């Protein structure tokens, strides 16, 4: 009984109009606006939505929504969290319906990141994904969930304890030499075939969210997205490259919210056997600075 | 009875030392030096060599070596060329041994590019390919030959006539809008599964050779090669991108000889059904100029 | 309309008893003795036989039996041979029944090797192969015929002309440096998926037959056969090794007749694209001399 | 929670220069020298290293490094060892960094063989394996670890108890008749798909290490390695052959340290169903003596 | 921890000479005679033997040998039997060596059938199976063990209890209408992929053994065996047919011992979901009577 994917996430923004154009044109996400005054939705697949975009916001993460298989796993995981001393709240029907899920609980991770556990997402099988721009392919979701995030943590061991309790596996996978003779350690945790769904280190961070990674089925879509960022003169924090752990081809670019999007292609299957690396396979060179990723990876 | 691959090529250079370091470090080719005063060899696979590098040169193409299956196809193709009015010379044993082939004929294509037809290459099965730097993978050769070239032509129809006679198929595949309201037409011809092995247009060219394309089995090797060009501050004429015909991910970078190398990955199978395009899938943006590829492809 | 396999061969021996023990114990062939005063048979598969062993012999080849698909190909190939000036004889029923074939013609190759062309071999489907010793596996026959032979030739070009007319393809595949500064050229020809079925050079030879190659399905059988030759102190002319053309693991050992047997495993598919080599992949070192294979291959 | 592969090993040598030439030329291993005064590394794959070669040594094993999946399995296995009465030491960070692992513990097996248990090896994905000589293929590592060793034991039952506790399975697989009417019993244990990773008997042994087996992906590399040993007149203790348990084609040759290397090809998958044999499939005949393997296997 | 196959069986006979000719000629088994005064062996595969044939016998079963995976399963199953009140004896080394196994225990089933449990059979990988007559194929053994037996039982529920404890699964699969208005119930139990390895009912039986089933890989071998029984005028108790449970094509014929052999082909995989039938798919008509199988199956 455990978390099985990153199901949805909630973000808040100061400029919904910018975000709509960004999501559709720069990424190929689908905008779904249900006429609600304070929010709209982004789709990737048959799910009613993967991302909720709240208005009047802080340009940061609002919540991560972690899926469990069904009510039995929901109830068991709640009691597990309670038993280990974590503070959780089981939500009422109104709150569950807000997220469009059958069961919902709210807590916060050890870093203060608002964390939701749910079962029973709404799937709109009648409404196939229709991307915000023409795409050669689609997104990799399914058993691997929407993507992955790096979020702020103040205590890596406590964060690891919490995510392990949720059913994640993983540990330190990068030891990065720093220009001070020190080492930066990044830990990466998986809960399904996606090489990682959550990752973190002890680094001071101005925002809850460092970056969100979204994966294309097709290299042609990743390339065109890269071209869109360049044509539109959008900051690329780390250039195209291949991480040693997940082995995806990715780059990192600015969002209208100032945290990074990592569009990518060809992520490898998660492994339970822990390894570490001291650098990337190639690329991911620093280009734009001021984003929390001034580290040497190749 | 026809040409079946680009088997070898000969180039001449002014700086053999630069070329050795370039081939090994920037590309991962193997240098084989047989102690000959005026030449060395580059390997890609079990062939004794794919490229002959002659010293004291012109920094351009010396010859293209087109393979036929055996002596019967050799003899039939010679008589075909003679019958259609082309000037060929069947080489003696000494000349054949120079190229390390069992049978050899020399002619020139309609653009003045020295052209060789041969059967029976020397394979050193005892000496497996050992790349000039560590590689994740290897090169795509085999049935597809060493790679592809764009070479100078003065008359596209005459060039097409000549290569069709050799057993190639293909025609105009790109019509590129030019800043003058004119169109540039590029023709691409295949003789095996490699999407193309020879290509050309009517464009004035300072050299016989515009570019040579070499294909990696592994994207990781292409990325690292791209990183090598950037770290070494080598001119990139056209940035990373995907052509609409061959669908390979490639970039074009300078050689010590001033003509371009196109390192690449994931070329599609040649098709006999002619199509045309007016642009690339993404990328291949102009970066360095002065190389004969100032055209808008995306 | 062409030759499709080496179907059977006839040999003559001075010591049938030695040959029986040799075939069964050292090789795992099946001895079938039909009570004929002057001959016995060796089986490899469901064929009534692959090898006829005649008594009172010369310890050399008596005939090679080349199969065509049926009577139409038989009649067409006969007329082809006649038309090109070769002397053939179409055999009567008694002669055909001697070889246990439906149609039979006799001629000699340009080297004086008695050569038979036939259609319609006798298959004893009721009598499955039962090897002369326990085997892990069986023999590779089927579409590839019984194996391959190197036979004496006095004129390589004439031999090539003759076998090409029979439907074989191939040419010079080895150029072997000799301790005299000279080169030995060996030509290898295929008529099916077996990398070669006949091979030859211009070398003076005391016998029609240099060696016969037989292929095991299982490496374990080849190893045990190698062990049998060693335990029985049988001459090994060339030690274990891998030829660059066929890529089989083989060794060459003496027969009671003084010509060599080449037991082997893992032969590659024949290719129509001619290549040449100047040495083997590894091994095939000279051990026993006096056998016509004192050449340096690794 | 258990050992999952032989991850690394440490050896000490009197002649590092000999070992470098041996590793590269005779075996095709990669030498990696990090400029440390007292040691260098041998690579087989993307791991930073598989073998540590310490200078100023005893020409024997220094340690075997057994990998577990992650920290949870590490902690559970430590407590398991403690609970069963074994003496272990959990290493500090400096000691862990020495081995380039995330967690490290040291103990000794019942035979006095220094034994390490670790999680989190360093993988240099940026630095693909580059063999010390040209290779047709590569090494079999991955889920099967670096290879297998036979090490000295004084009490087979105690050794079995210890390795079973570490998660290995296996028992007596060979009962070898001895020229004294006695029987030699060898036990073989697996911890993954490699047929065995550790093996032993009660035999008096002058060294900790009897032999190390390394596996090639390609038979052509094994043959060429065999040829290298012969050309360089290196002692072969047991000739080419196929063991009945693992079914690999192997030979055993001397190292500069006097213990044996067993280069091999085509190892079968480990089975949990115990069988025994009284001899090999073929070969492995004694050639050079004085190495602890004077036993009759075929 | 459980029984995993019928590994060997022991029978005793009054006429060893008849049995040798029967095994080889009528069935294609291999006779292996180790020069022991009182016994010989029958082989089916790489096992030293599957059947021990004791002389001076009773023309009935002597023992069934049930394999477990290794010593741990051996020790656990012994204690399980003891704990449930069964009488077992763990054998000494001399007794274990008699059966050529690493560990051995003896007991009797609830019907008085001597029952052995063992681990570690002797495999003669060096001595491939060599059938007693030419065969098109071989036997189905491997994970499915040697075959299956129906043995006498006096209490079906007690027999079921005992075999369930050994790790078998299965129950009543046939309810056969009898000419008395009664029903015969036969129970069939599996311990691997073989549809059943042991089967029984409450029927009075003059012998321990009703029949032994042996399976050919090839239908051609089953047909030829059927032809051998007919040509030699050997009693066929039940004619060719297909049972509804195992779905093999089989017949039942007399042995020199008077109990039946069931040669067969194409047995289906065992299923854990219990079904029953009231008749066969076709055939298995009574021919010879006096054998304990006078029941109507089609
Ligand atoms: O420990 C784990 C915890 C959660 C999920 C996985 C997983 C990994 C790959 C594919 C499917 C599931 C896992 O290994
Ligand atoms: O998906 C990923 C895989 C490996 C490393 C990172 C990473 C890069 C820079 C800073 C923090 C993490 C990552 O995002
Ligand atoms: O503030 C911003 C920061 C980064 C990107 C955009 C953007 C939005 C839509 C389309 C293109 C770029 C933006 O507005
Ligand atoms: O017209 C043609 C001429 C020469 C080669 C090909 C070919 C294309 C793809 C794969 C193999 C051969 C071809 O189509
Ligand atoms: O391989 C290729 C595929 C498609 C186009 C080109 C090309 C690009 C620029 C100028 C000329 C040709 C090419 O090289
Ligand atoms: O003139 C030149 C032009 C382009 C590249 C190189 C180069 C050669 C070796 C290594 C790196 C770059 C060079 O010398
Ligand atoms: O030219 C040829 C003549 C005769 C047979 C083949 C052949 C080769 C491989 C597989 C099947 C037939 C062939 O190529
Ligand atoms: O099958 C074969 C493949 C390649 C070469 C030979 C050969 C070796 C020595 C002398 C003549 C031929 C051969 O038999
Ligand atoms: O003259 C001979 C030459 C070579 C081998 C044998 C031989 C025959 C049977 C069994 C073993 C060896 C032989 O007799
Ligand atoms: O008992 C065992 C203990 C450890 C590993 C294996 C294993 C065997 C084959 C393939 C994968 C794992 C095993 O069976
Ligand atoms: O890998 C192996 C498999 C089977 C036996 C041995 C062995 C041979 C001689 C002495 C000790 C063990 C071995 O190494
Ligand atoms: O003492 C030694 C024992 C065995 C082999 C070597 C050796 C080392 C390098 C290259 C070839 C052989 C050696 O030096
Ligand atoms: O309950 C069972 C007990 C023993 C074996 C099996 C089994 C059946 C089919 C294939 C493999 C094992 C089984 O199902
Ligand atoms: O394998 C088998 C499958 C189904 C039934 C029987 C059987 C037939 C007659 C009497 C007793 C059992 C059998 O042997
Ligand atoms: O008593 C007997 C009963 C049944 C069969 C045989 C027999 C033995 C060998 C060959 C053929 C039949 C026999 O002897
Ligand atoms: Fe990421
Ligand atoms: Fe190109
Ligand atoms: Fe040969
Ligand atoms: Fe070994
Ligand atoms: Fe049965
Ligand atoms: Mg991971
Ligand atoms: Mg084309
Ligand atoms: Mg050939
Ligand atoms: Mg084992
Ligand atoms: Mg059943």
Please specify the SSE layout and strand pairing:
The structure is cut from a larger assembly and holds five copies of chain A (298 residues).
Chain A: E1 3-12, H1 16-27, E2 30-32, E3 39-43, E4 51-54, E5 60-68, H2 71-83, E6 89-90, H3 93-99, E7 101-108, E8 114-121, E9 148-151, H4 156-165, E10 172-177, E11 183-189, E12 198-200, E13 209-216, H5 219-231, E14 236-242, E15 249-254, E16 260-265, E17 282-283
Parallel strand pairs in A: 1-4, 5-8, 9-12, 13-16
Antiparallel strand pairs in A: 1-5, 2-3, 3-4, 6-7, 7-8, 9-13, 10-11, 11-12, 14-15, 14-17, 15-16
The complex binds biphenyl-2,3-diol (15 copies), fe (ii) ion (5 copies) and magnesium ion (5 copies).
Descriptive notes:
The structure is cut from a larger assembly and holds five copies of chain A (298 residues). The first copy, chain A, is 18% helix and 33% strand. Chain A has two domains: 1-134, 2,3-Dihydroxybiphenyl 1,2-Dioxygenase, domain 1; 135-298, 2,3-Dihydroxybiphenyl 1,2-Dioxygenase, domain 1 (Roll), CATH 3.10.180. Chain A is built from five helices and 17 strands. Chain A has a nine-stranded mixed β-sheet with strand order 10-11-12-9-13-16-15-14-17. In chain A, strands 2-3-4-1-5-8-7-6 form an eight-stranded mixed β-sheet. Chain A has helices at residues 16-27, 71-83, 93-99, 156-165, 219-231; strands spanning 3-12, 30-32, 39-43, 51-54, 60-68, 89-90, 101-108, 114-121, 148-151, 172-177, 183-189, 198-200, 209-216, 236-242, 249-254, 260-265, 282-283. Chain A has 298 residues and is an alpha+beta fold. The interface between A and B is medium-sized, with 18 and 18 residues. Bound molecules: biphenyl-2,3-diol (BPY) (15 copies), fe (ii) ion (5 copies) and magnesium ion (5 copies). One biphenyl-2,3-diol (BPY) binds at residues 18, 21-22, 25-26, 232, 234, 254-256 of chain A. One biphenyl-2,3-diol binds at residues 18, 21-22, 25-26, 232, 234, 254-256 of chain C.
